[PDB]
Amino acid sequence: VLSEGEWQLVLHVWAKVEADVAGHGQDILIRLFKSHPETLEKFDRFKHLKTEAEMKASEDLKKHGVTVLTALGAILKKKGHHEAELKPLAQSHATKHKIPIKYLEFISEAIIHVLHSRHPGDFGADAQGAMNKALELFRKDIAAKYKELGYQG
Ligand code: HEM
């Protein structure tokens, strides 16, 4: 579990993300798609996009980034009590979207890179450590639901 002090490091930096959800969501998805091109192939909506410049120009991608970060924020703010929020997400990601757990690890790494670029002063090693723990918790709970339903392990 995270301590109360580690949750406070997480949510302090997240309040800052909430100043510009759309810009954050962009940088994260672009970083994901460039670092791990195979992830872009999951998105019928985005697979036509070939360059970073086309990505940065897509309003629909920016819209999806807000969808993603809003759902994540609602989970973080539950500070681990996130069962009701996380269940619907794991079901759709397992059964509809077919998203490997490994891809959730990839987007976690994208999230941490972008927070580090945008908020150095609020995102030192101790906050980075806390955020890494929160994302691990998120992945571990999703992984449990996947296993239940019989999805890739
Ligand atoms: C932090 C992780 C993520 C969160 C919070 C998240 C959240 C969401 C939300 C809320 C939706 C819309 C409702 C639904 O279908 O459940 C969505 C859709 C989707 N997500 Fe995720 N997602 C995450 C990670 C990923 C990753 C890593 C991928 C793929 C590599 C992925 C692929 C998709 C696809 C294909 C859709 C549907 C897009 C469309 O409308 O066609 N998601 N996600």
PDB file of all heavy atoms in Angstrom, residues 74-98:
ATOM      1  N   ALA A  74      -9.292  10.097 -11.443  1.00  0.00           N
ATOM      2  CA  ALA A  74     -10.375   9.670 -10.570  1.00  0.00           C
ATOM      3  C   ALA A  74      -9.909   8.458  -9.756  1.00  0.00           C
ATOM      4  O   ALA A  74     -10.321   8.292  -8.609  1.00  0.00           O
ATOM      5  CB  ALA A  74     -11.611   9.315 -11.357  1.00  0.00           C
ATOM      6  N   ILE A  75      -9.042   7.636 -10.344  1.00  0.00           N
ATOM      7  CA  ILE A  75      -8.512   6.451  -9.631  1.00  0.00           C
ATOM      8  C   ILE A  75      -7.455   6.834  -8.570  1.00  0.00           C
ATOM      9  O   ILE A  75      -7.595   6.502  -7.406  1.00  0.00           O
ATOM     10  CB  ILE A  75      -7.897   5.430 -10.662  1.00  0.00           C
ATOM     11  CG1 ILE A  75      -8.998   4.754 -11.474  1.00  0.00           C
ATOM     12  CG2 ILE A  75      -7.014   4.394  -9.933  1.00  0.00           C
ATOM     13  CD1 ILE A  75      -8.418   4.175 -12.782  1.00  0.00           C
ATOM     14  N   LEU A  76      -6.505   7.682  -8.943  1.00  0.00           N
ATOM     15  CA  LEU A  76      -5.535   8.166  -7.995  1.00  0.00           C
ATOM     16  C   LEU A  76      -6.165   8.820  -6.784  1.00  0.00           C
ATOM     17  O   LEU A  76      -5.673   8.648  -5.659  1.00  0.00           O
ATOM     18  CB  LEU A  76      -4.519   9.129  -8.663  1.00  0.00           C
ATOM     19  CG  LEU A  76      -3.618   8.520  -9.746  1.00  0.00           C
ATOM     20  CD1 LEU A  76      -2.659   9.623 -10.262  1.00  0.00           C
ATOM     21  CD2 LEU A  76      -2.814   7.320  -9.199  1.00  0.00           C
ATOM     22  N   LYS A  77      -7.186   9.640  -7.006  1.00  0.00           N
ATOM     23  CA  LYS A  77      -7.812  10.371  -5.887  1.00  0.00           C
ATOM     24  C   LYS A  77      -8.553   9.473  -4.915  1.00  0.00           C
ATOM     25  O   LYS A  77      -8.900   9.932  -3.825  1.00  0.00           O
ATOM     26  CB  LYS A  77      -8.780  11.428  -6.413  1.00  0.00           C
ATOM     27  CG  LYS A  77      -8.047  12.634  -6.991  1.00  0.00           C
ATOM     28  CD  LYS A  77      -9.001  13.601  -7.682  1.00  0.00           C
ATOM     29  CE  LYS A  77      -8.190  14.575  -8.603  1.00  0.00           C
ATOM     30  NZ  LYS A  77      -9.097  15.586  -9.232  1.00  0.00           N
ATOM     31  N   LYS A  78      -8.719   8.186  -5.271  1.00  0.00           N
ATOM     32  CA  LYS A  78      -9.336   7.181  -4.388  1.00  0.00           C
ATOM     33  C   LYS A  78      -8.301   6.579  -3.489  1.00  0.00           C
ATOM     34  O   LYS A  78      -8.642   5.801  -2.587  1.00  0.00           O
ATOM     35  CB  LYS A  78      -9.925   6.046  -5.179  1.00  0.00           C
ATOM     36  CG  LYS A  78     -11.096   6.412  -5.958  1.00  0.00           C
ATOM     37  CD  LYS A  78     -12.102   6.975  -5.078  1.00  0.00           C
ATOM     38  CE  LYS A  78     -13.280   7.329  -5.941  1.00  0.00           C
ATOM     39  NZ  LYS A  78     -14.483   7.450  -5.068  1.00  0.00           N
ATOM     40  N   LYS A  79      -7.042   6.893  -3.763  1.00  0.00           N
ATOM     41  CA  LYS A  79      -5.924   6.482  -2.901  1.00  0.00           C
ATOM     42  C   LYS A  79      -6.009   4.970  -2.604  1.00  0.00           C
ATOM     43  O   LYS A  79      -6.059   4.555  -1.426  1.00  0.00           O
ATOM     44  CB  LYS A  79      -5.929   7.253  -1.574  1.00  0.00           C
ATOM     45  CG  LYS A  79      -5.618   8.756  -1.702  1.00  0.00           C
ATOM     46  CD  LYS A  79      -6.086   9.494  -0.416  1.00  0.00           C
ATOM     47  CE  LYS A  79      -4.975   9.723   0.578  1.00  0.00           C
ATOM     48  NZ  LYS A  79      -5.495  10.430   1.802  1.00  0.00           N
ATOM     49  N   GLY A  80      -6.027   4.166  -3.671  1.00  0.00           N
ATOM     50  CA  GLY A  80      -6.119   2.730  -3.483  1.00  0.00           C
ATOM     51  C   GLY A  80      -7.514   2.152  -3.249  1.00  0.00           C
ATOM     52  O   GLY A  80      -7.725   0.983  -3.533  1.00  0.00           O
ATOM     53  N   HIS A  81      -8.476   2.938  -2.770  1.00  0.00           N
ATOM     54  CA  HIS A  81      -9.828   2.411  -2.654  1.00  0.00           C
ATOM     55  C   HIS A  81     -10.543   2.481  -4.007  1.00  0.00           C
ATOM     56  O   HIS A  81     -11.630   3.038  -4.108  1.00  0.00           O
ATOM     57  CB  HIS A  81     -10.619   3.195  -1.588  1.00  0.00           C
ATOM     58  CG  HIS A  81      -9.925   3.074  -0.274  1.00  0.00           C
ATOM     59  ND1 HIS A  81      -8.841   3.888   0.173  1.00  0.00           N
ATOM     60  CD2 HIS A  81     -10.124   2.004   0.571  1.00  0.00           C
ATOM     61  CE1 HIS A  81      -8.411   3.274   1.313  1.00  0.00           C
ATOM     62  NE2 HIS A  81      -9.108   2.187   1.539  1.00  0.00           N
ATOM     63  N   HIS A  82      -9.966   1.911  -5.050  1.00  0.00           N
ATOM     64  CA  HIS A  82     -10.431   2.266  -6.396  1.00  0.00           C
ATOM     65  C   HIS A  82     -11.211   1.189  -7.126  1.00  0.00           C
ATOM     66  O   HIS A  82     -11.190   1.128  -8.370  1.00  0.00           O
ATOM     67  CB  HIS A  82      -9.246   2.693  -7.265  1.00  0.00           C
ATOM     68  CG  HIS A  82      -8.075   1.720  -7.216  1.00  0.00           C
ATOM     69  ND1 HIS A  82      -6.748   2.176  -7.029  1.00  0.00           N
ATOM     70  CD2 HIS A  82      -8.161   0.281  -7.250  1.00  0.00           C
ATOM     71  CE1 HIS A  82      -6.002   1.048  -7.098  1.00  0.00           C
ATOM     72  NE2 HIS A  82      -6.809   0.015  -7.217  1.00  0.00           N
ATOM     73  N   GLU A  83     -11.926   0.361  -6.375  1.00  0.00           N
ATOM     74  CA  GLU A  83     -12.490  -0.856  -6.944  1.00  0.00           C
ATOM     75  C   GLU A  83     -13.563  -0.532  -7.977  1.00  0.00           C
ATOM     76  O   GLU A  83     -13.562  -1.042  -9.108  1.00  0.00           O
ATOM     77  CB  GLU A  83     -13.117  -1.692  -5.844  1.00  0.00           C
ATOM     78  CG  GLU A  83     -12.138  -2.080  -4.789  1.00  0.00           C
ATOM     79  CD  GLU A  83     -12.025  -1.070  -3.651  1.00  0.00           C
ATOM     80  OE1 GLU A  83     -12.945  -0.229  -3.446  1.00  0.00           O
ATOM     81  OE2 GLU A  83     -11.039  -1.223  -2.886  1.00  0.00           O
ATOM     82  N   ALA A  84     -14.471   0.347  -7.585  1.00  0.00           N
ATOM     83  CA  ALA A  84     -15.589   0.715  -8.460  1.00  0.00           C
ATOM     84  C   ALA A  84     -15.093   1.374  -9.772  1.00  0.00           C
ATOM     85  O   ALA A  84     -15.659   1.165 -10.824  1.00  0.00           O
ATOM     86  CB  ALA A  84     -16.546   1.639  -7.714  1.00  0.00           C
ATOM     87  N   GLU A  85     -13.989   2.105  -9.707  1.00  0.00           N
ATOM     88  CA  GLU A  85     -13.519   2.813 -10.880  1.00  0.00           C
ATOM     89  C   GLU A  85     -12.724   1.867 -11.771  1.00  0.00           C
ATOM     90  O   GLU A  85     -12.721   1.983 -13.018  1.00  0.00           O
ATOM     91  CB  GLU A  85     -12.647   3.990 -10.461  1.00  0.00           C
ATOM     92  CG  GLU A  85     -13.389   5.097  -9.691  1.00  0.00           C
ATOM     93  CD  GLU A  85     -13.747   4.735  -8.259  1.00  0.00           C
ATOM     94  OE1 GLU A  85     -13.191   3.770  -7.685  1.00  0.00           O
ATOM     95  OE2 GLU A  85     -14.631   5.408  -7.708  1.00  0.00           O
ATOM     96  N   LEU A  86     -12.051   0.909 -11.141  1.00  0.00           N
ATOM     97  CA  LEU A  86     -11.044   0.165 -11.869  1.00  0.00           C
ATOM     98  C   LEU A  86     -11.662  -1.059 -12.545  1.00  0.00           C
ATOM     99  O   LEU A  86     -11.273  -1.424 -13.666  1.00  0.00           O
ATOM    100  CB  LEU A  86      -9.903  -0.205 -10.914  1.00  0.00           C
ATOM    101  CG  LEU A  86      -8.706  -0.896 -11.538  1.00  0.00           C
ATOM    102  CD1 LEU A  86      -7.424  -0.540 -10.834  1.00  0.00           C
ATOM    103  CD2 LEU A  86      -8.984  -2.425 -11.451  1.00  0.00           C
ATOM    104  N   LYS A  87     -12.761  -1.553 -11.987  1.00  0.00           N
ATOM    105  CA  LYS A  87     -13.396  -2.743 -12.528  1.00  0.00           C
ATOM    106  C   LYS A  87     -13.884  -2.600 -13.944  1.00  0.00           C
ATOM    107  O   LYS A  87     -13.499  -3.398 -14.827  1.00  0.00           O
ATOM    108  CB  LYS A  87     -14.551  -3.208 -11.636  1.00  0.00           C
ATOM    109  CG  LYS A  87     -14.946  -4.658 -11.821  1.00  0.00           C
ATOM    110  CD  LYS A  87     -16.249  -4.796 -12.562  1.00  0.00           C
ATOM    111  CE  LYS A  87     -16.993  -6.012 -12.041  1.00  0.00           C
ATOM    112  NZ  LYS A  87     -17.302  -5.838 -10.599  1.00  0.00           N
ATOM    113  N   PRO A  88     -14.651  -1.509 -14.233  1.00  0.00           N
ATOM    114  CA  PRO A  88     -15.123  -1.269 -15.611  1.00  0.00           C
ATOM    115  C   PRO A  88     -14.008  -1.060 -16.631  1.00  0.00           C
ATOM    116  O   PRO A  88     -14.034  -1.579 -17.796  1.00  0.00           O
ATOM    117  CB  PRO A  88     -16.017  -0.052 -15.458  1.00  0.00           C
ATOM    118  CG  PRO A  88     -16.453  -0.086 -13.988  1.00  0.00           C
ATOM    119  CD  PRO A  88     -15.232  -0.537 -13.279  1.00  0.00           C
ATOM    120  N   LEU A  89     -12.941  -0.456 -16.147  1.00  0.00           N
ATOM    121  CA  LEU A  89     -11.794  -0.207 -16.972  1.00  0.00           C
ATOM    122  C   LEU A  89     -11.104  -1.542 -17.320  1.00  0.00           C
ATOM    123  O   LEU A  89     -10.745  -1.816 -18.486  1.00  0.00           O
ATOM    124  CB  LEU A  89     -10.861   0.735 -16.203  1.00  0.00           C
ATOM    125  CG  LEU A  89     -10.004   1.774 -16.896  1.00  0.00           C
ATOM    126  CD1 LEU A  89      -8.862   2.136 -15.986  1.00  0.00           C
ATOM    127  CD2 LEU A  89      -9.425   1.225 -18.157  1.00  0.00           C
ATOM    128  N   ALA A  90     -10.969  -2.424 -16.333  1.00  0.00           N
ATOM    129  CA  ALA A  90     -10.220  -3.663 -16.625  1.00  0.00           C
ATOM    130  C   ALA A  90     -11.031  -4.558 -17.530  1.00  0.00           C
ATOM    131  O   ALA A  90     -10.509  -5.155 -18.454  1.00  0.00           O
ATOM    132  CB  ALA A  90      -9.833  -4.408 -15.327  1.00  0.00           C
ATOM    133  N   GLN A  91     -12.335  -4.547 -17.352  1.00  0.00           N
ATOM    134  CA  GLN A  91     -13.176  -5.329 -18.248  1.00  0.00           C
ATOM    135  C   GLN A  91     -13.080  -4.889 -19.727  1.00  0.00           C
ATOM    136  O   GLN A  91     -12.911  -5.752 -20.657  1.00  0.00           O
ATOM    137  CB  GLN A  91     -14.626  -5.302 -17.732  1.00  0.00           C
ATOM    138  CG  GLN A  91     -14.710  -5.500 -16.201  1.00  0.00           C
ATOM    139  CD  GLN A  91     -16.147  -5.755 -15.666  1.00  0.00           C
ATOM    140  OE1 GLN A  91     -16.373  -6.701 -14.886  1.00  0.00           O
ATOM    141  NE2 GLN A  91     -17.090  -4.867 -16.013  1.00  0.00           N
ATOM    142  N   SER A  92     -13.223  -3.563 -19.982  1.00  0.00           N
ATOM    143  CA  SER A  92     -13.191  -3.100 -21.356  1.00  0.00           C
ATOM    144  C   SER A  92     -11.801  -3.323 -21.945  1.00  0.00           C
ATOM    145  O   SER A  92     -11.672  -3.744 -23.110  1.00  0.00           O
ATOM    146  CB  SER A  92     -13.600  -1.609 -21.430  1.00  0.00           C
ATOM    147  OG  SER A  92     -12.615  -0.774 -20.863  1.00  0.00           O
ATOM    148  N   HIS A  93     -10.757  -3.112 -21.145  1.00  0.00           N
ATOM    149  CA  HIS A  93      -9.384  -3.236 -21.662  1.00  0.00           C
ATOM    150  C   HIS A  93      -8.956  -4.691 -21.951  1.00  0.00           C
ATOM    151  O   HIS A  93      -8.221  -4.994 -22.940  1.00  0.00           O
ATOM    152  CB  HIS A  93      -8.385  -2.552 -20.719  1.00  0.00           C
ATOM    153  CG  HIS A  93      -8.575  -0.981 -21.076  1.00  0.00           C
ATOM    154  ND1 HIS A  93      -9.801  -0.256 -20.836  1.00  0.00           N
ATOM    155  CD2 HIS A  93      -7.608  -0.105 -21.637  1.00  0.00           C
ATOM    156  CE1 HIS A  93      -9.565   1.029 -21.242  1.00  0.00           C
ATOM    157  NE2 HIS A  93      -8.373   1.041 -21.720  1.00  0.00           N
ATOM    158  N   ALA A  94      -9.558  -5.598 -21.187  1.00  0.00           N
ATOM    159  CA  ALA A  94      -9.307  -7.024 -21.384  1.00  0.00           C
ATOM    160  C   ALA A  94     -10.102  -7.563 -22.561  1.00  0.00           C
ATOM    161  O   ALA A  94      -9.533  -8.176 -23.493  1.00  0.00           O
ATOM    162  CB  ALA A  94      -9.640  -7.819 -20.088  1.00  0.00           C
ATOM    163  N   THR A  95     -11.396  -7.279 -22.546  1.00  0.00           N
ATOM    164  CA  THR A  95     -12.323  -7.950 -23.447  1.00  0.00           C
ATOM    165  C   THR A  95     -12.565  -7.185 -24.732  1.00  0.00           C
ATOM    166  O   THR A  95     -12.712  -7.797 -25.794  1.00  0.00           O
ATOM    167  CB  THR A  95     -13.702  -8.250 -22.742  1.00  0.00           C
ATOM    168  OG1 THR A  95     -14.508  -7.050 -22.643  1.00  0.00           O
ATOM    169  CG2 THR A  95     -13.442  -8.817 -21.301  1.00  0.00           C
ATOM    170  N   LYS A  96     -12.646  -5.856 -24.653  1.00  0.00           N
ATOM    171  CA  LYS A  96     -12.927  -5.073 -25.859  1.00  0.00           C
ATOM    172  C   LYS A  96     -11.649  -4.587 -26.489  1.00  0.00           C
ATOM    173  O   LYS A  96     -11.346  -4.870 -27.671  1.00  0.00           O
ATOM    174  CB  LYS A  96     -13.825  -3.875 -25.574  1.00  0.00           C
ATOM    175  CG  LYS A  96     -14.346  -3.219 -26.862  1.00  0.00           C
ATOM    176  CD  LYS A  96     -15.234  -1.954 -26.613  1.00  0.00           C
ATOM    177  CE  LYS A  96     -16.670  -2.345 -26.309  1.00  0.00           C
ATOM    178  NZ  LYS A  96     -17.068  -3.583 -27.109  1.00  0.00           N
ATOM    179  N   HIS A  97     -10.895  -3.807 -25.747  1.00  0.00           N
ATOM    180  CA  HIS A  97      -9.725  -3.201 -26.405  1.00  0.00           C
ATOM    181  C   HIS A  97      -8.572  -4.190 -26.661  1.00  0.00           C
ATOM    182  O   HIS A  97      -7.726  -3.971 -27.520  1.00  0.00           O
ATOM    183  CB  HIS A  97      -9.265  -1.997 -25.589  1.00  0.00           C
ATOM    184  CG  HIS A  97     -10.487  -1.012 -25.428  1.00  0.00           C
ATOM    185  ND1 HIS A  97     -11.455  -0.735 -26.450  1.00  0.00           N
ATOM    186  CD2 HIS A  97     -10.787  -0.449 -24.201  1.00  0.00           C
ATOM    187  CE1 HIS A  97     -12.350  -0.004 -25.787  1.00  0.00           C
ATOM    188  NE2 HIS A  97     -12.009   0.110 -24.551  1.00  0.00           N
ATOM    189  N   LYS A  98      -8.504  -5.242 -25.824  1.00  0.00           N
ATOM    190  CA  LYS A  98      -7.416  -6.211 -25.841  1.00  0.00           C
ATOM    191  C   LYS A  98      -6.089  -5.552 -25.581  1.00  0.00           C
ATOM    192  O   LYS A  98      -5.180  -5.656 -26.418  1.00  0.00           O
ATOM    193  CB  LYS A  98      -7.348  -6.914 -27.193  1.00  0.00           C
ATOM    194  CG  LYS A  98      -8.672  -7.527 -27.631  1.00  0.00           C
ATOM    195  CD  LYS A  98      -9.131  -8.530 -26.614  1.00  0.00           C
ATOM    196  CE  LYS A  98      -9.957  -9.605 -27.267  1.00  0.00           C
ATOM    197  NZ  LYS A  98     -10.112 -10.824 -26.345  1.00  0.00           N
TER     198      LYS A  98
END
